[PDB]
mmCIF file of C-alpha atoms in Angstrom:
data_model
loop_
_atom_site.group_PDB
_atom_site.id
_atom_site.type_symbol
_atom_site.label_atom_id
_atom_site.label_comp_id
_atom_site.label_asym_id
_atom_site.label_seq_id
_atom_site.Cartn_x
_atom_site.Cartn_y
_atom_site.Cartn_z
ATOM 1 C CA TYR O 1 0.000 0.000 0.000
ATOM 2 C CA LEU O 2 1.011 3.672 -0.197
ATOM 3 C CA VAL O 3 1.452 4.185 3.529
ATOM 4 C CA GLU O 4 1.599 1.332 6.041
ATOM 5 C CA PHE O 5 2.778 1.729 9.633
ATOM 6 C CA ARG O 6 2.110 0.226 13.054
ATOM 7 C CA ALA O 7 -0.321 2.256 15.142
ATOM 8 C CA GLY O 8 -3.017 1.535 17.682
ATOM 9 C CA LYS O 9 -6.528 2.907 17.424
ATOM 10 C CA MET O 10 -9.010 4.176 19.991
ATOM 11 C CA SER O 11 -12.733 3.605 20.369
ATOM 12 C CA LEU O 12 -15.348 5.963 21.774
ATOM 13 C CA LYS O 13 -16.742 3.854 24.589
ATOM 14 C CA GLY O 14 -19.916 5.674 25.569
ATOM 15 C CA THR O 15 -18.458 9.110 26.170
ATOM 16 C CA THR O 16 -14.830 8.261 26.906
ATOM 17 C CA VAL O 17 -12.106 7.612 24.334
ATOM 18 C CA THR O 18 -10.606 4.211 25.094
ATOM 19 C CA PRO O 19 -7.339 3.212 23.336
ATOM 20 C CA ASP O 20 -6.983 -0.310 21.948
ATOM 21 C CA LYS O 21 -4.269 -2.667 23.160
ATOM 22 C CA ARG O 22 -4.103 -4.772 20.000
ATOM 23 C CA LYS O 23 -1.084 -4.463 17.731
ATOM 24 C CA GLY O 24 -2.615 -3.113 14.553
ATOM 25 C CA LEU O 25 -1.364 -1.207 11.543
ATOM 26 C CA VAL O 26 -2.684 1.714 9.536
ATOM 27 C CA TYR O 27 -2.593 1.350 5.768
ATOM 28 C CA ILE O 28 -3.788 3.592 2.965
ATOM 29 C CA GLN O 29 -5.025 1.738 -0.091
ATOM 30 C CA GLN O 30 -5.452 4.187 -2.941
ATOM 31 C CA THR O 31 -7.560 2.283 -5.442
ATOM 32 C CA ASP O 32 -8.305 3.390 -9.016
ATOM 33 C CA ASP O 33 -11.889 3.995 -7.864
ATOM 34 C CA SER O 34 -10.545 7.355 -6.644
ATOM 35 C CA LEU O 35 -11.427 6.329 -3.101
ATOM 36 C CA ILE O 36 -8.599 6.890 -0.635
ATOM 37 C CA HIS O 37 -9.152 3.880 1.589
ATOM 38 C CA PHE O 38 -7.928 4.590 5.102
ATOM 39 C CA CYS O 39 -8.111 1.245 6.857
ATOM 40 C CA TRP O 40 -6.909 -0.200 10.144
ATOM 41 C CA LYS O 41 -5.815 -3.820 10.175
ATOM 42 C CA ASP O 42 -4.977 -5.873 13.251
ATOM 43 C CA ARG O 43 -1.670 -7.763 13.009
ATOM 44 C CA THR O 44 -2.811 -10.354 15.537
ATOM 45 C CA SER O 45 -5.699 -11.932 13.612
ATOM 46 C CA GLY O 46 -5.022 -10.086 10.365
ATOM 47 C CA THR O 47 -8.550 -8.720 10.404
ATOM 48 C CA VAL O 48 -9.409 -5.358 8.858
ATOM 49 C CA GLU O 49 -11.694 -3.468 11.223
ATOM 50 C CA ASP O 50 -11.828 0.085 9.937
ATOM 51 C CA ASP O 51 -12.221 0.919 6.258
ATOM 52 C CA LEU O 52 -13.284 4.424 5.228
ATOM 53 C CA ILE O 53 -13.281 6.587 2.112
ATOM 54 C CA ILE O 54 -11.105 9.641 2.639
ATOM 55 C CA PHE O 55 -11.413 12.714 0.435
ATOM 56 C CA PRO O 56 -9.602 16.123 0.376
ATOM 57 C CA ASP O 57 -10.465 18.536 3.221
ATOM 58 C CA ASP O 58 -13.241 16.191 4.433
ATOM 59 C CA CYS O 59 -10.969 14.119 6.628
ATOM 60 C CA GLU O 60 -8.304 16.216 8.338
ATOM 61 C CA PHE O 61 -5.557 14.080 9.864
ATOM 62 C CA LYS O 62 -3.810 16.026 12.621
ATOM 63 C CA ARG O 63 -1.829 15.444 15.819
ATOM 64 C CA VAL O 64 -3.063 16.261 19.319
ATOM 65 C CA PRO O 65 -0.728 18.867 20.886
ATOM 66 C CA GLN O 66 -2.614 18.510 24.163
ATOM 67 C CA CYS O 67 -0.988 15.150 24.893
ATOM 68 C CA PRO O 68 2.165 14.575 27.024
ATOM 69 C CA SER O 69 3.001 11.432 25.048
ATOM 70 C CA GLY O 70 2.836 13.209 21.713
ATOM 71 C CA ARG O 71 2.181 9.963 19.846
ATOM 72 C CA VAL O 72 -1.556 10.624 19.752
ATOM 73 C CA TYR O 73 -2.964 11.513 16.341
ATOM 74 C CA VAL O 74 -6.551 12.223 15.333
ATOM 75 C CA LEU O 75 -8.473 11.996 12.079
ATOM 76 C CA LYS O 76 -10.831 14.935 12.398
ATOM 77 C CA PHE O 77 -13.693 14.852 9.938
ATOM 78 C CA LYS O 78 -14.949 18.324 9.016
ATOM 79 C CA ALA O 79 -18.251 16.620 8.284
ATOM 80 C CA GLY O 80 -20.313 14.331 10.482
ATOM 81 C CA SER O 81 -18.326 15.488 13.516
ATOM 82 C CA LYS O 82 -16.447 12.180 13.449
ATOM 83 C CA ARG O 83 -13.064 11.920 15.175
ATOM 84 C CA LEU O 84 -10.782 8.879 15.095
ATOM 85 C CA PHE O 85 -7.858 8.710 17.513
ATOM 86 C CA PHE O 86 -4.700 6.713 16.799
ATOM 87 C CA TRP O 87 -1.350 6.316 18.552
ATOM 88 C CA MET O 88 1.952 5.664 16.780
ATOM 89 C CA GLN O 89 3.587 2.392 17.801
ATOM 90 C CA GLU O 90 6.888 3.601 16.357
ATOM 91 C CA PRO O 91 9.938 3.249 18.663
ATOM 92 C CA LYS O 92 11.277 6.649 17.607
ATOM 93 C CA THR O 93 9.524 9.962 17.034
ATOM 94 C CA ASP O 94 11.956 10.776 14.215
ATOM 95 C CA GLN O 95 9.290 9.657 11.734
ATOM 96 C CA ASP O 96 6.085 10.506 13.614
ATOM 97 C CA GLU O 97 5.145 13.710 11.804
ATOM 98 C CA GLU O 98 6.709 12.223 8.671
ATOM 99 C CA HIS O 99 4.115 9.444 8.669
ATOM 100 C CA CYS O 100 1.331 11.956 9.267
ATOM 101 C CA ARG O 101 2.537 14.161 6.410
ATOM 102 C CA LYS O 102 2.576 11.212 3.998
ATOM 103 C CA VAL O 103 -0.887 10.257 5.211
ATOM 104 C CA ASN O 104 -2.282 13.772 4.725
ATOM 105 C CA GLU O 105 -0.771 13.867 1.230
ATOM 106 C CA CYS O 106 -2.467 10.619 0.192
ATOM 107 C CA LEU O 107 -5.743 11.530 1.909
ATOM 108 C CA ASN O 108 -5.934 14.812 0.003
ATOM 109 C CA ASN O 109 -4.512 13.401 -3.227
ATOM 110 C CA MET W 1 -31.507 25.618 5.418
ATOM 111 C CA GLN W 2 -28.118 26.612 4.024
ATOM 112 C CA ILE W 3 -25.185 24.239 3.599
ATOM 113 C CA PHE W 4 -21.523 24.831 2.816
ATOM 114 C CA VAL W 5 -20.213 22.670 -0.021
ATOM 115 C CA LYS W 6 -16.443 22.947 -0.356
ATOM 116 C CA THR W 7 -14.998 22.038 -3.751
ATOM 117 C CA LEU W 8 -11.454 20.920 -4.675
ATOM 118 C CA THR W 9 -10.483 24.565 -5.151
ATOM 119 C CA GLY W 10 -11.532 25.227 -1.575
ATOM 120 C CA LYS W 11 -14.568 27.143 -2.794
ATOM 121 C CA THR W 12 -17.340 27.131 -0.220
ATOM 122 C CA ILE W 13 -20.587 26.962 -2.172
ATOM 123 C CA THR W 14 -23.579 27.907 -0.051
ATOM 124 C CA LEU W 15 -26.566 25.850 -1.171
ATOM 125 C CA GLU W 16 -30.210 26.094 -0.139
ATOM 126 C CA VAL W 17 -31.548 22.659 0.756
ATOM 127 C CA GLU W 18 -33.877 20.847 3.133
ATOM 128 C CA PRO W 19 -33.264 17.690 5.245
ATOM 129 C CA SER W 20 -35.847 15.886 3.102
ATOM 130 C CA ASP W 21 -33.973 16.856 -0.072
ATOM 131 C CA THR W 22 -32.347 13.998 -1.948
ATOM 132 C CA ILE W 23 -28.614 14.039 -2.693
ATOM 133 C CA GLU W 24 -29.371 13.698 -6.416
ATOM 134 C CA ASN W 25 -31.293 16.980 -6.267
ATOM 135 C CA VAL W 26 -28.349 18.625 -4.533
ATOM 136 C CA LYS W 27 -26.139 17.604 -7.452
ATOM 137 C CA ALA W 28 -28.678 19.153 -9.835
ATOM 138 C CA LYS W 29 -28.679 22.392 -7.841
ATOM 139 C CA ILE W 30 -24.885 22.527 -7.990
ATOM 140 C CA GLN W 31 -25.080 21.956 -11.743
ATOM 141 C CA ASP W 32 -27.243 25.072 -11.958
ATOM 142 C CA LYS W 33 -24.752 27.266 -10.132
ATOM 143 C CA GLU W 34 -21.486 25.708 -11.347
ATOM 144 C CA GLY W 35 -22.631 23.758 -14.396
ATOM 145 C CA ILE W 36 -20.536 20.688 -13.643
ATOM 146 C CA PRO W 37 -22.179 17.363 -14.704
ATOM 147 C CA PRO W 38 -23.585 15.517 -11.621
ATOM 148 C CA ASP W 39 -22.067 12.283 -12.973
ATOM 149 C CA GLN W 40 -18.610 13.644 -12.150
ATOM 150 C CA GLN W 41 -19.808 15.192 -8.903
ATOM 151 C CA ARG W 42 -18.756 13.327 -5.783
ATOM 152 C CA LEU W 43 -20.178 14.570 -2.495
ATOM 153 C CA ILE W 44 -18.444 13.397 0.674
ATOM 154 C CA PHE W 45 -19.581 13.606 4.286
ATOM 155 C CA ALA W 46 -17.658 12.036 7.191
ATOM 156 C CA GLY W 47 -15.365 9.912 5.041
ATOM 157 C CA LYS W 48 -18.369 8.568 3.169
ATOM 158 C CA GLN W 49 -19.631 9.376 -0.315
ATOM 159 C CA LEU W 50 -23.225 10.567 -0.542
ATOM 160 C CA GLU W 51 -25.481 8.324 -2.609
ATOM 161 C CA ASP W 52 -27.963 9.904 -5.034
ATOM 162 C CA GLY W 53 -30.785 7.766 -3.664
ATOM 163 C CA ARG W 54 -30.410 9.156 -0.142
ATOM 164 C CA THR W 55 -31.560 12.256 1.727
ATOM 165 C CA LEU W 56 -29.698 14.776 3.874
ATOM 166 C CA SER W 57 -31.404 13.335 6.954
ATOM 167 C CA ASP W 58 -29.926 9.918 6.140
ATOM 168 C CA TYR W 59 -26.441 11.343 6.591
ATOM 169 C CA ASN W 60 -27.662 13.502 9.490
ATOM 170 C CA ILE W 61 -26.676 16.639 7.612
ATOM 171 C CA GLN W 62 -27.811 19.441 9.893
ATOM 172 C CA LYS W 63 -28.040 23.162 9.227
ATOM 173 C CA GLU W 64 -24.818 24.949 8.216
ATOM 174 C CA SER W 65 -22.983 21.650 7.695
ATOM 175 C CA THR W 66 -19.786 21.354 5.670
ATOM 176 C CA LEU W 67 -20.172 19.193 2.583
ATOM 177 C CA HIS W 68 -17.410 18.308 0.145
ATOM 178 C CA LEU W 69 -17.546 18.166 -3.635
ATOM 179 C CA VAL W 70 -14.702 16.417 -5.413
ATOM 180 C CA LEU W 71 -14.562 16.043 -9.187
ATOM 181 C CA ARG W 72 -13.244 12.708 -10.436
ATOM 182 C CA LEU W 73 -10.403 13.490 -12.826
ATOM 183 C CA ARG W 74 -9.769 10.065 -14.333
ATOM 184 C CA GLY W 75 -8.305 11.418 -17.550
ATOM 185 C CA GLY W 76 -4.937 13.114 -17.410
#
């Protein structure tokens, strides 16, 4: 795929964001259907849980500066008020923003 | 109600619609203002493309919501 890295996701349990403990990966499958597929696949069972259709400006991938860890990222949808939280499972932060940048590029193009 | 449809150019097109209005009609309205064929019009809302056989209420599109219109440029 275009972009594929290890990152955990979070689920909105009721009214509280609860991070997942499973070792999953985030991959962007840009198909010829012009649908930027942003999907989350678990490396444990190899099951794809999340699979959305990202389009320019609609889905704004950004990092949360209000986090001490700094590995928390969020896919803020300008429509539907949807927000998906993810946390980089990368050992070093030398490629944290780099991954995000590549993601944003593919999501908007 | 009024909605804000942002195109690829970042243009925020304010369109007059109702919750009971079908997406296909929205495309027709945009074709009146812009003139772009609805067949190449792709409306997105919350990482999901809007189907022509659906209404604004189906996607829970409230008043002053931000819609997205992306033109499929397959030829290049």
